Amino acid sequence: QALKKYTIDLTERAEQGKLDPVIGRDEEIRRTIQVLQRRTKNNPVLIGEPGVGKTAIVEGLAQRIINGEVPEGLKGRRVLALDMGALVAGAKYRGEFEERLKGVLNDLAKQEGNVILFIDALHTMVGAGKADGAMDAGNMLKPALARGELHCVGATTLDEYRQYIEKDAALERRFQKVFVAEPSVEDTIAILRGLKERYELHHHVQITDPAIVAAATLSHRYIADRQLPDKAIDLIDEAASSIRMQIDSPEELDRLDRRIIQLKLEQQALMLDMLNEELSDKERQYSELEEEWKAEKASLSGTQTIKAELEQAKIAIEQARRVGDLARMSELQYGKIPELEKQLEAATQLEGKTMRLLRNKVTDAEIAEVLARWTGIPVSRMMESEREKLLRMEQELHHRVIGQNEAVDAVSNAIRRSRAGLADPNRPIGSFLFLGPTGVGKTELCKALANFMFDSDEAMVRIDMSEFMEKHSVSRLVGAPPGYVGYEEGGYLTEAVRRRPYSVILLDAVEKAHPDVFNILLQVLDDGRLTDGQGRTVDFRNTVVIMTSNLGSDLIQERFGELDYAHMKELVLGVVSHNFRPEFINRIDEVVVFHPLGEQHIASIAQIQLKRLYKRLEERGYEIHISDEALKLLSENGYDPVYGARPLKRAIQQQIENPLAQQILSGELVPGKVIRLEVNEDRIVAVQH
C-alpha cells in the first residue's frame, strides 16, 4: 500500500538495533505519551532549539514502545516515519500529490489508531505543493488532524516555528507544544556514557570516562555558538577519529621510509661504499618497526572485535529479557560476561605494554586538542616548545619593548594565568589600562603581544577610539538595530571577535571618545557578553582587552622621579578617577603606569630601529655597518622627556635615511659593497669599502 512506499518504519529500526539509545528525557516522553492519547488533537510538536534532543525523543518513544516500558495503550503502536521528499518527488501531474496524501490518510484509517505518524520537520509541511491547482498539504491535514483521527508527532525547531507555523494559526492550534529544553551538564554526561558505548563500537577506540566529563564541561565552556548535548558529541567523535587516524599511520615510518629511499637514490647514483651497510641496517630497522606496527594493529583489532562480541552478548541478553528463554539467561550472563570482560582487560594491559611506536585511548588530552582546533582558543595542554616560549615571555617581549618592566611583567602574568587555567571563566583574560605619556611603547607593547601570540602584528581587533567622539560610536561597533540601515551587516567589534574568539582587542587612545562610550565596555569587562543589533550575544570571555590612554602625561613626566611605583599608580589612578566614572575603573584588571625614557633605553631603541633599517636595505640588496660614535650622536640628539621615543625615530629617519637616499639614487653606492656610517664633524658620512 501507500505506507510501503512513502514511509519508513522506526519500530523496525529500534527492533533491529539500528537506532541510537536515548537516555534521560523523563518528562518529555511522559508528556508526549500524554498528548498522543487524547480524543482530539493527538498532535505533539516537539519544539526546542535545534539539537537538544528532539528527534531523539521520537527515537526514545520508538525504543520504549518496542521494549514495552510504556503504558498499555501504546503497546503495539507502530511508529511510521513520513518524509515529505518521498511524497512530492513524483507528483509531476496535477493532483498526484493529493492522491498520494489521501491514500496515506485512508491507509492510516484502515489501521484503527494503531500507527503513530512521525513527520520530521513539521515546519516544512505548511505549504508543500502550493501551485496553481493545489491543496497546500496543510489544507488536507487540517480536517484529519482536527478530528483526532491522526496521531501525528511534530519535530521542529523554534525559529522555524515562528517563521512557518505561527504564520498560519489554523494549523498552529492543531498541534500541542512540548518544549524540549537544553539539557544540563550532568545529563549531558549521562547521554555521553550511552553514546560512549556506541562510538567505541564504531570507531575502534576506548573512550575513558574523564575524557567524557572533560568534554562536557569544556564544550559547555568554550563553544558558545551551538547547543548541548551535541557539541560534546562533536568533540568526542572527532577525538575518536583523531585517535583512529593516529592508529592508522605512524611518523617514524615516514622518516625511515624517506630516509631509505633517499639513501637508495644516493647509492644508485654512486654506482668507498658503506651505504649498502647503512641501508641494510636501516632496512632491518624499518622491517622491525613495520612488524611491531602490524603486531599492534592485530592486537587492537582483536581487542576491538572482542569488545564488539561482548556487546553482541549484551544485545542477546536483552533479546532474552524480551523473549524469556530459561537457560539462556544464566548461560549468557555467567558464561559470557565475566570471561570476556577479564580477557578484555587482559588485552587492555597487553596494549598498555606493547603500544610504543603512542596514544591508543581517547583521553582528555585529545579532547583538549580537538577543542583547541575547533574554536581557536588555546585550550590544550602545553608542549615544551610552547611552554618554554611561555616562560620566556618577559624575554621575548623585551626583544621589541625595551624599557617598561612593569607592564611586561603584568601582561606576562595575565597570559600565564590564562594558560595555566586559573582565569575567572566569566570575565575576559586581561582587561588592562595602559597609561603613560606620549609615545613610550604602549601600542608597541600591544603589537608585541600580537607578534608573540599570533606571530603577526596585523592580527588584533583594533578599534580606534578617537573616531568615537559622538555616540555614533556605539552604533558603529554593536551594529545597526532592526529597521535601520545596516541591519544586514552587523557591527565591527562583535563580528570581528566572533570570527576569532581568542584575539587581542586594542582600544587605541581611549580617552578621546565621548565619556559615555565607556558603557559598552561595562558589559564587556564585567561579563564578556556583548549583544549586537542582529540580537545574538558574543562571547568575549577569551579576549585580551587593552585600552591605551595617556590621561596622566603631565603628572607622570612631572613625578616619576623621586617616587616609587605604588604611590604613582595611586595618584594617577586619582586623576583617572576624575576623568572616568567609578563604575568603570572598578572593572579594570590592572591599571599600569608607564614612564618616561632614559638615555640607555633610547640607545637600545636606536639599535632596534637600526636592526629593522638593516633589514630594509638587505631586502633592497645592501649592507650597513655603523660606528659607535654615530650611535652616540643619535643618542645625544634624541633625548627629550616630553616626546618620548619618536624623536629617535625621526632623528634616525633624517640623519641616516636622507643622505643615504641622496646617495642611493645618486647611482653612487654600488650594492654588495659594505657601507660604513662613520661620523662627520656633525653629520654621518657613507663610504664604499
Ligand X SMILES: Nc1ncnc2c1ncn2[C@@H]1O[C@H](COP(=O)(O)OP(=O)(O)OP(O)(O)=S)[C@@H](O)[C@H]1O
Q: Which residues bind ligand X (CB under 6 A)?
A: 20, 22-25, 50-51, 53-56, 157, 170, 191, 229-230, 233, 401-404, 438-444, 509, 526, 548, 550, 583, 586, 605, 608, 645-646
CB nearer to a second copy: pick between 121 and 275: 121
| Touching a second copy, residues 460-519 (CB under 8 A) | 462-464, 466-467, 469-476, 478-491, 495, 499, 516, 519
Indicate the helix (H) or strand (E) that contains 178. Answer: strand 176-179
Residue entry with cell 618577559 = 394
Least distance from ligand X to the Cβ atom of residue 441, Å? 3
CB nearer to a second copy: pick between 170 and 661: 170
| Cα 319 from chain centroid (whole Å) | 42
Answer for which of 96, 98, 176, 259 binds a second copy (CB under 8 A) is 176
**Mapping DSSP to helix (H, G, I), strand (E, B) and coil, where does residue 663 land?**
helix
Indicate the helix (H) or strand (E) that contains 376. Answer: none
Cα separation, 531 vs 520, whole angstroms: 10
Q: Does 90 bind a second copy (CB under 8 A)?
A: no
Strand bridging mode 591-592 / 44-47: unpaired
Other C-beta atoms lying within 10 Å of the C-beta of residue 384: 7
Q: Are the CB atoms for 132 and 97 separated by under 8 Å?
A: no
Q: Does 88 bind a second copy (CB under 8 A)?
A: yes
Name the amino acid, one letter, at 281: D
Q: Are the CB atoms for 606 and 652 separated by under 8 Å?
A: yes
Residue entry with cell 498528548 = 35
DSSP of 19-61, one letter per residue? Answer: S------HHHHHHHHHHHSSSS---EEEE-STTSSSHHHHHHH
Residues sharing a CB contact under 8 Å with residue 293, sequence separation 6 or more, in sequence order: 250, 253, 357
Angle at 537 between CA 532 and CA 540, to 5 degrees: 100
CB nearer to a second copy: pick between 164 and 594: 164
DSSP designation for 73? G
C-alpha cell at 61: 518513544
CB nearer to ligand X: pick between 306 and 555: 555
Residue 646 near which of ligand X, a second copy, none (CB within 5-8 Å, type-dependent): ligand X
Angle at 643 between CA 641 and CA 648, to 5 degrees: 95
Least distance from ligand X to the Cβ atom of residue 117, Å? 17
Least distance from ligand X to the Cβ atom of residue 543, Å? 18
Q: Find the part of the chain contacting a second copy (CB under 8 A) among 30-38, 131-139, 559-567, 629-637.
A: 131-139
Instruction: List residues bridging with 611 in a β-sheet.
Output: none
C-alpha to C-alpha distances, 266 to 252, 287, 630, nearest whole angstrom: 21, 21, 53
Residue 163 near which of a second copy, ligand X, none (CB within 5-8 Å, type-dependent): a second copy
Least distance from a second copy to the Cβ atom of residue 489, Å? 7
Indicate the helix (H) or strand (E) that contains 507. Answer: strand 504-508
SS3 of 396-461: the string is: HHCCCCCCCHHHHHHHHHHHHHHHHCCCCCCCCCEEEEECCCCCCCHHHHHHHHHHHHCCCCCCCE
Q: Does 85 bind a second copy (CB under 8 A)?
A: yes
x/- contact string, 523-562, with a second copy (CB under 8 A)? x--x--xxx-xxx---------------------------
Name the amino acid, one letter, at 194: G
CB nearer to a second copy: pick between 81 and 568: 81
Residue 627 near which of a second copy, ligand X, none (CB within 5-8 Å, type-dependent): none
Q: Does 341 bind a second copy (CB under 8 A)?
A: no
Residues sharing a CB contact under 8 Å with residue 449, sequence separation 6 or more, in sequence order: 397, 411, 415, 460, 504, 544, 546
CB nearer to ligand X: pick between 453 and 679: 453
CB nearer to a second copy: pick between 499 and 683: 499
| Size of the residue set binding a second copy (CB under 8 A) | 96
Cα separation, 627 vs 678, whole angstroms: 5
CB nearer to a second copy: pick between 128 and 401: 128
Least distance from a second copy to the Cβ atom of residue 409, Å? 26
Least distance from a second copy to the Cβ atom of residue 439, Å? 6
Residue 25 near which of a second copy, ligand X, none (CB within 5-8 Å, type-dependent): ligand X
CB nearer to a second copy: pick between 579 and 666: 579
C-alpha to C-alpha distances, 598 to 126, 269, 486, 491, 601, nearest whole angstrom: 76, 63, 49, 42, 5
CB nearer to a second copy: pick between 69 and 583: 583
CB nearer to a second copy: pick between 30 and 130: 130
Least distance from ligand X to the Cβ atom of residue 14, Å? 13
C-alpha cell at 425: 571563566
Q: Does 297 bind a second copy (CB under 8 A)?
A: no
Q: Does 135 bind a second copy (CB under 8 A)?
A: yes
Cα separation, 185 vs 277, whole angstroms: 60
Q: Are the CB atoms for 480 and 489 separated by under 8 Å?
A: yes
Q: Does 642 bind a second copy (CB under 8 A)?
A: no
Instruction: List residues bridging with 504 in a β-sheet.
Output: 544
Q: Does 158 bind a second copy (CB under 8 A)?
A: yes
Residue 132 near which of ligand X, a second copy, none (CB within 5-8 Å, type-dependent): a second copy
Residue 56 near which of ligand X, a second copy, none (CB within 5-8 Å, type-dependent): ligand X
Q: Find the part of the chain contacting a second copy (CB under 8 A) among 57-65, 78-86, 99-107, 246-254.
A: 78-86
Q: Find the part of the chain contacting a second copy (CB under 8 A) among 136-144, 262-270, 589-597, 679-687.
A: 136-144
CB nearer to a second copy: pick between 403 and 501: 501
Q: Which residues of 532-555 are buried (b: 16+ CB within 10 A; e: fewer)?
A: bbbeeebbbbbbbbbbbbbbbbeb
Radius of gyration of the chain (CA): 35
Q: Does 50 bind a second copy (CB under 8 A)?
A: yes
Cα separation, 184 vs 277, whole angstroms: 64
Q: Find the part of the chain contacting a second copy (CB under 8 A) among 160-168, 272-280, 396-404, 544-552.
A: 160-168
x/- contact string, 591-620, with a second copy (CB under 8 A)? ----------------------------x-
CB nearer to ligand X: pick between 53 and 528: 53
Answer for which of 3, 10, 80, 140 binds a second copy (CB under 8 A) is 140
Breaks, C-N > 2.5 A, in the chain lie after 271, 357
Residue entry with cell 496543510 = 138
Least distance from a second copy to the Cβ atom of residue 274, Å? 34
Q: Does 200 bind a second copy (CB under 8 A)?
A: no
CB nearer to a second copy: pick between 439 and 638: 439
Residue 243 near which of a second copy, ligand X, none (CB within 5-8 Å, type-dependent): none
Least distance from a second copy to the Cβ atom of residue 485, Å? 4
